Amino acid sequence: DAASDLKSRLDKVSSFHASFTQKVTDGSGAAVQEGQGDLWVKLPNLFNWHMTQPDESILVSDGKTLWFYNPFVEQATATWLKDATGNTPFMLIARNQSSDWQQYNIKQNGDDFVLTPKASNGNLKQFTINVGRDGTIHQFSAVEQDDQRSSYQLKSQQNGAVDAAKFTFTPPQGVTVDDQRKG
Ligand SMILES: CCCCCCCCCCCCCCCC(=O)N[C@H](CSC[C@H](COC(=O)CCCCCCCCCCCCCCC)OC(=O)CCCCCCCCCCCCCCC)C(N)=O
């Protein structure tokens, strides 16, 4: 079915670097903001997301901690990855339990998938992904409770090995770190 097809496309992703553009649109479909940058990914749970435009910001998952670094205000926040990802389909990738997939209704037309949480919890109503049978991810989006859509268009997906140094984060010199990890 759509779920087993999606997982079989996601099984074919190992690690990549991609460039992304970002289009945020309100419920009425008007433009809220535009942005671009780089994404490094390595299954099951590692990523480095670098917005350059319009405002620079870095998200690094080392697989346990999610680091948010905003170099403009020279601040970095550390959170548990499981806390930070809990209102997303993260776990559909980060492990492969039947449990996780049963929390979503999935509709498919070719490379286009829509995932709707059964019980919607958090500000996130809906997710879309466009991913080929080869495992190239062309697009994903998240719809917030107020119908604001964040759309990511990916390109230049290079499926080489990516250095594991991409998924370490050391706060730079004179960056104040707000460590929100309760031990
Ligand atoms: C295999 C390795 C692991 C998976 C790879 C991950 C790929 C990139 C991960 C991070 C990219 C998104 C970061 C943008 C959000 C942002 O800049 N928020 C900034 C500041 S932070 C505030 C923000 C509040 O939340 C928001 O409003 C934004 C929406 C949250 C992002 C959802 C988009 C992804 C869902 C689409 C795909 C669904 C289908 C998957 C099929 C299984 O909350 C957070 O703190 C960020 C937490 C999100 C980080 C994890 C993303 C979960 C992705 C789930 C898997 C998607 C698969 C894509 C590639 C395989 C802001 N201004 O709001």
Numbering used by the authors: 1 to 183
What does the paper behind this entry write?
With the exception of a subset of lipoproteins that carry a transport avoidance signature and remain in the inner membrane, the majority of lipoproteins are destined for the outer membrane. Their transport is directed by the Lol system that comprises the inner membrane transporter LolCDE, the periplasmic chaperone LolA, and the outer membrane receptor LolB, itself a lipoprotein. LolA and LolB share structural homology, both being incomplete β-barrels with a central hydrophobic cavity closed by an alpha helical lid, but perform distinct functions.
The importance of R43 in the lipoprotein transfer process was underlined by the identification of a mutant at this position, R43L, that though competent to accept lipoproteins from LolCDE was unable to transfer them to LolB. The protein conformation is similar to that of liganded WT LolA with an rmsd of 0.68 Å over 167 residues, but the three acyl chains of Pal are positioned differently in the protein cavity. Here, the R1 and R3 chains run almost parallel with R2 inserting in the middle at the cavity base. The R1 chain is less deeply inserted in the R43L protein cavity by about 4 Å compared to its position in the wild-type structure. The cysteine carbonyl is rotated by about 180°, pointing toward the β-barrel curve in the R43L complex while facing the helical lid in the wild-type LolA structure. First, the F140 side chain is flipped toward the β-barrel curve of the protein, in a position that conflicts with the location of chain R1 observed in the wild-type complex structure. Second, the shallower insertion of the ligand means that Y152 is unable to interact with the R2 acyl chain carbonyl as it does in the wild-type structure. Instead, E144 situated nearer the mouth of the cavity forms a hydrogen bond with the carbonyl backbone of acyl chain R1. We found that the Pal +1 cysteine observed in the LolA R43L structure sterically clashes with LolB, while in the LolA wild-type structure, it is accommodated in a LolA surface groove allowing the linker joining the triacyl group to the lipoprotein mature domain to exit the complex.
